[PDB]
């Protein structure tokens, strides 16, 4: 208390953007503390003063104990080449777990493409799929080939049987079995315990979300007449990003974590296609007034995205977003996708009328996304951070 009151720069520090890098001296001790002692004292000070920075301070603590480059490997992209070549045994399945809605089979598809190793990909879920899977597994174990088994979270008992089969089996030195999942509790514990696990999460952000959306949708689909179609998709893409990223900031963003995903995006794209085809009727260009904005807004607010929404305030928020984005004003040269961004300067919608122009505008988005992009206050991130910080401590209690 005395040091807090006596210090003059305490006010500027407590309001600083990154207080963990400039924690002042507020502890009394008989003999000067070692660097790890100062690190733990600053960790306590940050936890007391600025809990939102705790995670960052936690990193510094690790950096002061295990070196500045302990976590630096994780930010680098995963290199499956060496891991599959050396670390993984032939009889150890490579479990590739993604968050629900994300896919990880492309990683090993590219891995086998660059490794020049034949791989057979099999979609699991049907009995014919099971027979194809086990015959291909036998062929690969006797011939040293790679097997992909997609969405094996759909058959838990078959996963147990596969684990039992792999335990006794003696594969060839080049055999590799990959099993892709979406992280479900149904996955057997023995299969997870007896297999290398890789967890894949999408890169958070509006930019990455919109890039994924534009990649998933074919170019020819967006290129169809009228030329306004592409712009519609852009808005839709933006809308999708704006909600999915907002799901990260629940309960402030959305009152609960809804499953807004690829299914809603496909349904909305289909709705846009059908209604724009009905309106255009073969015309190469249609006026922005002629686009059925009411139809798109209503179908997306009550059917496509609003079906999952059960709260009336979440429905109100979805309606406000749709009424803000899907209007004729979105076809102006000065339309503002997001206002009061970072408190100064606001996102402007690209002037182009082609798909490549929209993808270029997405690729040149600044890498300084804040919750103001989503309409949230900029302090929302801090709240998320502090929640995570508390969460970390709770987890650290469970490891006691």
């Amino acid at each position: 208390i005395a040091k807090v009151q006596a210090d003059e720069q305490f006010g500027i520090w407590l309001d600083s953007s990154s207080p963990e890098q400039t924690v002042p001296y507020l502890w009394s001790e008989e003999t000067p503390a070692t660097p790890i002692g100062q690190a733990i004292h600053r960790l306590l000070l940050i936890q007391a003063f600025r809990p939102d920075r705790l995670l960052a301070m936690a990193h510094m603590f690790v950096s002061t104990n295990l070196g500045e480059s302990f976590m630096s490997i994780m930010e680098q992209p995963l290199d499956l080449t060496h891991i599959v070549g050396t670390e993984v045994k032939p009889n150890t399945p490579v479990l590739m777990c993604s968050v629900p809605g994300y896919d990880a089979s492309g990683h090993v598809e590219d891995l086998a493409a660059e490794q020049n190793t034949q791989i057979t990909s099999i979609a699991i879920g049907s009995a014919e799929g099971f027979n194809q899977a086990d015959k291909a597994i036998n062929t690969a174990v006797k011939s040293g080939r790679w097997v992909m088994l997609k969405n094996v979270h759909l058959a838990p008992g078959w996963l147990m049987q596969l684990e039992k089969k792999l335990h006794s089996l003696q594969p060839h030195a080049c055999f590799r079995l990959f099993l892709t999942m979406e992280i479900n509790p149904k996955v057997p514990v023995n299969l997870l315990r007896a297999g290398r696990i890789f967890v894949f999460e999408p890169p958070p952000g509006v930019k990455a979300n919109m890039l994924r959306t534009f990649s998933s949708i074919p170019v020819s689909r967006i290129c169809k007449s009228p030329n306004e179609r592409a712009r519609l998709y852009f808005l839709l893409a933006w809308f999708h990003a704006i909600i999915q990223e907002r799901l990260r900031y629940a309960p402030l963003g959305w009152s609960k974590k809804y499953e807004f995903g690829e299914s809603d995006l496909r349904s909305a794209c289909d709705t846009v296609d059908t209604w724009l085809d009905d309106t255009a009727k073969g015309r190469q260009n249609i006026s922005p007034d002629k686009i059925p904005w009411s139809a798109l807004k209503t179908l997306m607010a009550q059917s496509i995205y609003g079906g999952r929404v059960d709260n009336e305030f979440d429905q109100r928020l979805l309606n406000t977003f749709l009424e803000r984005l899907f209007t004729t004003r979105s076809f102006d040269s000065e339309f503002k996708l997001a206002c009061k961004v970072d408190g100064h300067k606001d996102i402007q919608m690209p002037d182009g009328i082609r798909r490549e122009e929209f993808v270029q505008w997405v690729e040149l988005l600044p890498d300084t996304q804040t919750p103001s992009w989503l309409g949230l206050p900029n302090n929302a991130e801090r709240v998320l951070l502090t929640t995570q910080g508390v969460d970390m401590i709770s987890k650290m209690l469970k490891m006691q």
Partner: protein, 249 residues
């Protein structure tokens, strides 16, 4: 609470009686479990399976499932739960003393923390019926008007009831008008819930409807409050920024 002939006719009394009936049972359960934990840690009690799992959860900080018979925030630790439980039971003792010595009518003049109550929506229902019974009004012709009073001990009208502990998320209420705020959360000093006769006057464009969520998880909706927008602020900004009211923070 001592139920009598006149007290049972009070909707507030009935609510408070149910609240204290739940709270006393939860108190006995938690206190007995903690006493068993103390006995085991002292070395005079053998670890049964339930005792072993309870001790494991308390050491790890996981909230025991046998506890929390009321609505609680998800994922909350044991320490937060016991602190909140102590505050709730202290509030229940205060309301019990008010009901026993202060009389039934004092339950109208006491300021109730909605966070402490297990079912605050039942409290809001009780208040509405109270007003309806006292004024001989039909229940459905009553609508809730919210008046945030910064004055200490603000006068309570016949249909105005005091509620404390309300937190405003992302907004500041000055002169009973909301302004967008970059602060994490602001505390409403004293909220007067006033049950007024419903009028067919059209709702203004400068009026925003805010949810009063039970806690920060925004999982239980208690009721809604109509507030007045201050300055040139769009209600869509309030909708997008997630402005709301929390019974407890």
């Amino acid at each position: 609470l001592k139920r009598t002939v006149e007290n049972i006719k009070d909707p507030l009394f009935r609510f408070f009686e149910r609240e204290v009936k739940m709270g006393a049972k939860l108190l006995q359960d938690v206190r007995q479990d903690l006493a068993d934990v103390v006995q085991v840690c002292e070395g005079k009690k053998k670890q049964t399976n339930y005792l072993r799992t309870l001790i494991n959860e308390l050491v790890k900080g996981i909230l025991p499932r046998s506890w929390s018979h009321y609505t609680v925030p998800a994922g909350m630790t044991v320490i937060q739960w016991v602190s909140d439980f102590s505050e709730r039971i202290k509030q229940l003792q205060n309301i019990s003393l008010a009901a026993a010595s202060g009389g039934a009518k004092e339950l109208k003049n006491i300021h109730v923390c909605l966070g402490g109550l297990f079912v605050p929506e039942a409290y809001i229902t009780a208040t509405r019926q109270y007003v309806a019974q006292a004024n001989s009004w039909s229940l459905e012709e009553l609508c809730l008007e919210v008046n945030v009073t910064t004055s200490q001990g603000a006068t309570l009208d016949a249909c105005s009831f005091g509620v404390t502990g309300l937190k405003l998320q992302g907004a500041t209420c000055n002169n009973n008008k909301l302004s967008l705020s970059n602060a994490i959360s602001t505390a409403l000093p004293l909220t007067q819930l006033r049950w007024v006769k419903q009028t067919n006057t059209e709702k203004k464009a400068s009026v925003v409807t805010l949810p009063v969520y039970l806690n920060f998880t925004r999982a239980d909706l208690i009721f809604t409050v109509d507030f007045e927008i201050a300055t040139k602020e769009d209600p869509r900004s309030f909708y997008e920024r997630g402005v709301a009211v929390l019974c407890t923070e």
